[PDB]
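Posted in: Protein Modeling Q&A

I'm a second-year student putting together a small comparison for a lab meeting, and my supervisor asked me to include a predicted structure for Green fluorescent protein. I've never done this before, so apologies if this is the wrong subforum. The sequence is pasted below exactly as I got it from our records. If anyone can share the structure token output, I'd also love a short note on what stands out.
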Amino acid sequence: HHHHTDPMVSKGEELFTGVVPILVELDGDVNGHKFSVSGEGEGDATYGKLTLKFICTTGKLPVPWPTLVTTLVLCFSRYPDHMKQHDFFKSAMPEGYVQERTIFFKDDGNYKTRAEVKFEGDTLVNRIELKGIDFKEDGNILGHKLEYNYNSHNVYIMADKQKNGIKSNFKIRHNIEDGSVQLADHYQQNTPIGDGPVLLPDNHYLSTQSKLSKDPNEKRDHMVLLEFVTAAGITLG
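Accepted answer (user: helix_wrangler)
Welcome! Here is the predicted structure, written out as tokens:
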């Protein structure tokens, strides 16, 4: 069923055995265009697999769906057995963690995000606030000039010992419809909500694949997301 020598690893693995229902909530304001997004689906940490469908509940999303993928749940990452001592994300559960980002779109505006990821009963909830400022109303984001797709990448995770958390910097490239690229430079920090101990990782990376699709029967503005996330970059074992 599951068997680790470390009872701290056992506790976190316990919560993520089987398929866990996910509820995402986002409240957003980009250049004063207010919008909300609601997402539902399932995570299976055994396979690093997430399936989610998001709806814009206020009408038309004022930014391209691909720009929200990173913002709209890294506790579903598959950590190999020999790396389970490095899984900060599950160790923080069920009380959960805060995930803060600044996302700089090159030659354009920035998103600031704050999210609380935690269990409400059996359901893993991701509650997000997004503020976006300094966007060009002729630009690739408010102009909707990005392709509806996502590109595979490897992200590095490092411990922030002093915060009892983690930090990460990484770049996302978004395809523009002319074959060029829009860079989104992400700065991330995560901190525990609870006062109890967490697993602080050695340096490693997450390998992430994402596929974006549409529900042919859906008339609301929406995104269907299939994501795989796998931890790597530690050999020992």
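A couple of things worth pointing out for your meeting: The chain is about 5% helix and 50% strand. The chain has one domain: 7-232.
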